[model samples]
Target chain A: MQGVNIYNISAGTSVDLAAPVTTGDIVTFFSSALNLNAGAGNPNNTTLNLFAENGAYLLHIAFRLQANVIIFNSRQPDGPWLVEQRVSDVANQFAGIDGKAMVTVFDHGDKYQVVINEKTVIQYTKQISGLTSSLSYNATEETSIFSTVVEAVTYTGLA
Target chain B: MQGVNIYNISAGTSVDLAAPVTTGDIVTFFSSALNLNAGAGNPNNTTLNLFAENGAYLLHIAFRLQANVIIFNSRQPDGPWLVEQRVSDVANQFAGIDGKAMVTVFDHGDKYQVVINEKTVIQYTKQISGLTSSLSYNATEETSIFSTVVEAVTYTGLA
Candidate 1:
């Protein structure tokens, strides 16, 4: 696992990559949860937040069912803490698995693309630079672990 | 998946193999859970119940942390509904993983061997012939699923 970044990331305890993630450098997440729970009292969001050199929150990747959106670098703190979510039809392209799923985010310079199970892709626009130095993983106030993966990401929770 | 059995087995609705599992034939299970919970409220026991040709219960494989015990075939309906369990120092040999674990039972004609992660073994004596025809998977009365597996058994719930 040399040169690979693996972390059980969480809020305020983000990870600094060995090399800042650049264009075409994919970052991945493997989650223990498979499906979405709708409505209030539900754990509907998983985020992969990227940070800039000055510790500014540059990008927010939200994995959701109602709408999977990417809030580009917009901040009151290098990021918004409130309803600063943006959505497009492309972000809603979610078809997840149960028990577990492996998802990769591709930095394609002008846009970001999500690949699931190594088979499906969810594409979107991008506004941040590829020079993200730190990252964090959060499953939205829940206990489901969204592990930051490097290579050979596996979701053992699948049925 | 030819000649292999893949089942989401449960109580009452047990699975009968295409061929009766005989000597040297290994039966395996993959779980979506990894760690153990102690005390009265914890879901502790998991069973791999085997029945003979005459519908008589022949063997019981109980996977537990305090004790991983096994009871040989001797059921009124080919099984017992109450505590007819036996224990040796060998049965408590479980070192399970969380999020997922893989276990296989090896029938060595004269005894049984339990293997976990394909690396550790828990050995025990056998009382009846290895001509069992049916099987069942139960993770106590909880929602965790213990899927019966054949050929390549994979435990995806691993961290």
Candidate 2:
């Protein structure tokens, strides 16, 4: 997991919807930057900036609601790594309001699994031991750390 | 973070894909459920089970490849202390083929977010920490956790 430089990535205005993303590939960061449909309320506006691998911070999983998902360790993915856990069954749906949520995150080794359109539900194991931290990032994005339509994500252990 | 009663979570059948999920509603489990339209490779058969709130073990988020949106964490019409993140996408023309995944989990404050169909892909702060086991007896769906598909998903809450 190395090499990254994402920032302010945006697209998808309508037209049957065509802006899911297809970037340079190989991504994984902990500076935190996952925004989905970030016009602050509609349209499509992405913002990315991930590149902090070897430096530390590789065990983050997130899904947006008002842009909520955190896991920034080794100090500073913007600080804090667990805050913003709601997955949108309803509560503003990604913070644009209305109903819309589909998230997927997987990374073996350190142990991490979260699915929202294929449903595995939840799972994570850093060092085992009744692990903790599952929500706590009042960082920004309108409170509750929100953003993801693709951001600083890299885990190409092959397959 | 309460009501749960999952039953026969099966797989095998050559990597099952009967398709007919329940327990609130939401799917996408990979690691060998490969189809993506006859790409070959069926991973293992597909397995998943959910029914634990007193045994804990809830808090998840995952997304990979072609992501757009996926969010989970339910209750009521949704109000379990206000935990919701529902979003969906990844359907530009994909019915399957290792190019579609989505999952959503909630608890421990609840959190999940992913947006690739419209941007904002990757946000997780759900580390259910520990729970061990629970599911009456016979269980099958939980093989390494699986999910992939996000060419679309949007919502900022309020649905």
Candidate 3:
């Protein structure tokens, strides 16, 4: 059983933030941007990705700004990345000038759950089994902030 | 890709809370207390539990008042339980008299992650891989309120 591992990925600027997280039987990359503000000229994108020891993605959750909607996507290492869900967010719940965004991606043994702003907005059941080798955060704009990364080992009560 | 299934179990008072959760796959339960205010005599306890199909608890995440710590436990349906993690929140971040608490539990295929006040405080990977038949919440004090429940499927891609 792994103790709670919390990471602060906040930097003055945007960089490919990575953590020394070993692949877990099941993993969740929970992240939040205390202040993620994007402007008309800045379509900032922030992503939480879990990769294998081979640097291949096991699961990916992204908050992308496009067409006034926060496009929430769940992707795998291969193709067919699905736009699991999208929020109009015209009021900018996740993309306002000073809005906040909290995203949690749960890599269950056989599926994945994507939660945004405290809501479980999407569920992906296709091709959902793998251990995460590493966790990374890719942010498009430096102004946006990445607050925390919680990589935990999950338990299921079974034989 | 299954659209995430969201459930809202907002009861004005304490009740036996449950959801139609299944076993073997990963399940994430999202719950929040919109407005939590504990007075001097309020030993408020808000708990989220995953039970076996037979109404026995497999795991529990509790915000207990006396210790000012969030308790994470894994147990059999009817016997001794293991205390996985106890986060001493002396600052009372999650127990402020008029504060709110949002708890998210990630039942990864083989582990469980307990997050409170937007922080992942504990993770347990022992006894992983059981099917969750239902999700429930047992509230000790009526003054302590629970607002919602969101359940979703999860996916992690690997060969």
Candidate 4:
């Protein structure tokens, strides 16, 4: 696969995106049976970690599948990630839609938009100055991501 | 009546911290029943919005009290907040403990230590330089914070 393949990946697996999710990129995730590990705890259950060009921290898209809560968070290159902003997307809108969800991240030069099952859920702007460089997923024993496809699309800004 | 008084505050309220939480500051909150709203949705439930010396976004100490989840998130001066880092603190350790919680943030210029009821839970480092200049709680009808005490305590570093 062009992007990293995370199918049935073991716990504690961090797959690097061969091509980082930079400006004007639409990274899509095809997942199956991606629910929270039954009888397990939520340990950043699933995440799309994004970084800056210099490998500093940019931002990350986080998900708690079974709980239906997806978090959009960020930090600088060297410090910790803190909750800067979260709108309606902070609610448990995806409750119970664990194993079967399609997540798409639209990375503009300035911000990122997240589409869950084709529904525009979050539109997060950049905290830093530049675009992203590195990308990965917090793949754990809780759930396995099956497919990832990164496509460079044209940006027209959020309408 | 000293630090920002959040007792019986209304919804959609944003109070400013007179003295920003800079280095060697121990901001303590004498709160009561500080849990998530009994019949309300989680809307950034509770937070201590921390900013940099330049009045830029540094980080925010967030909590979903009823959910027992405290998030440490940040961003640059301009942009969105992302999940840069979250360790064991991401789990729902504060579940169902609404309304009553004593929270304290120790500013060390290098990192911030969060103490919940005298138990150290999170020690997060800075993503940007300088100390925090702004501080506020996400107070609403869901919960009312009573007292906020900002003290300049001696700091040696996280031990």
TM-score of each: 0.39, 0.22, 0.42, 0.37
Q: In candidate 2 chain B, where is summed lDDT lowest over 10 consecutive residues?
A: B150-159
Off by over 4 Å in 1: A1-159, B11-13, B38-44, B64-96, B119-121, B140-159
Q: How far is each candidate from the true structure, as Cα RMSD in Å?
A: 12.5, 19.9, 9.3, 20.2
lDDT of 3 by residue, A83-114 (tens): 45555653344332232335555554555565
CAPRI verdict (incorrect, acceptable, medium, high) for model 3: incorrect
| lDDT against the true structure, each candidate | 0.48, 0.28, 0.46, 0.49
Please provide, for model 1 over B8-46, each residue's C-alpha lDDT reduced to its tens digit, 9 standing for 90 to 100.
565325776655666545555555454454322232355
Top of the candidates by DockQ: 3
Listed for each candidate, the true contacts retained, as a fraction, are 0.00, 0.00, 0.00, 0.00
lDDT of 4 by residue, B1-159 (tens): 012212222233433444455665445443435433343226445565566665565767665544445678787767677665443442244433443455556665687776654355677787765665555455455443322322111111112
lDDT of 2 by residue, B5-94 (tens): 112233322121233222222222222133332221232222222223343323323221233433333222222422534345433323
Instruction: Note the B-chain TM-score for every model.
Output: 0.63, 0.28, 0.64, 0.64
Candidate 2 stretches with Cα past 4 Å from truth are A1-159, B1-29, B34-53, B60-69, B74-82, B92-159
On a 0 to 100 scale, what is the lDDT of residue B32 in model 3? 32
Best-to-worst order by TM-score is: 3, 1, 4, 2
lDDT, model 2, position A47: 20
Q: Candidate 1 vs candidate 2: which has greater lDDT?
A: 1
TM-score of 4: 0.37
Residue-level lDDT tens digits of model 3 in B116-144? 53455666664534556656555544534
| lDDT per residue (tens digit) for residues A6-81 in model 4 | 2222344434444455664444443434443443226445666566766655667766544445678888767777
